Amino acid sequence: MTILFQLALAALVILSFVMVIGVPVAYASPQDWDRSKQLIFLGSGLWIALVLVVGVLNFFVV
Amino acid sequence: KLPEAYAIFDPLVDVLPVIPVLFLALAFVWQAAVGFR
Amino acid sequence: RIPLWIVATVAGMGVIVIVGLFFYGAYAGLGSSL
């Protein structure tokens, strides 16, 4: 539960760091954002579940 | 202080506040890269 | 050839770092008050 929480919360940080540097260069070079429109979508969708994971999961650790 | 669990992020949260300033800064990194058009 | 805009943003952060070290030194050094 705890490590499980620190995983979700900690991974959620690296995804953000990755997501943050990503989306930019994404819409940036139109070399796609059609193939990456796929990547970004998964990052975005993923992120939300994560927040919800850490959200609900918070009430069990603290 | 930060709820017991998140304590591991104490240090992280220590720098968050200053970020906004960075953006005003970046805008300059950019223009420089794009040769002040 | 090293792109100018990089020479700057690098030499730049480099100064905020040293000048920032000075500001930290103000709450620890001899110039402290403690």
Binding site: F17, V20, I21, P24, V25, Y27, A28, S29, P30, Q31 | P11, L12, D14, V15, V18, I19, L22, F23, A25, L26, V29, W30, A33, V34 | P3, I6, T9, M13
Partner: peptide
Amino acid sequence: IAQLTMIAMIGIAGPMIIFLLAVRRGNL
């Protein structure tokens, strides 16, 4: 102790997300 580790990365991040664009040359 030394969360300067943090700053550092999120710091070279700003210039990075434009540099990679200087490489993939486009939209600056």
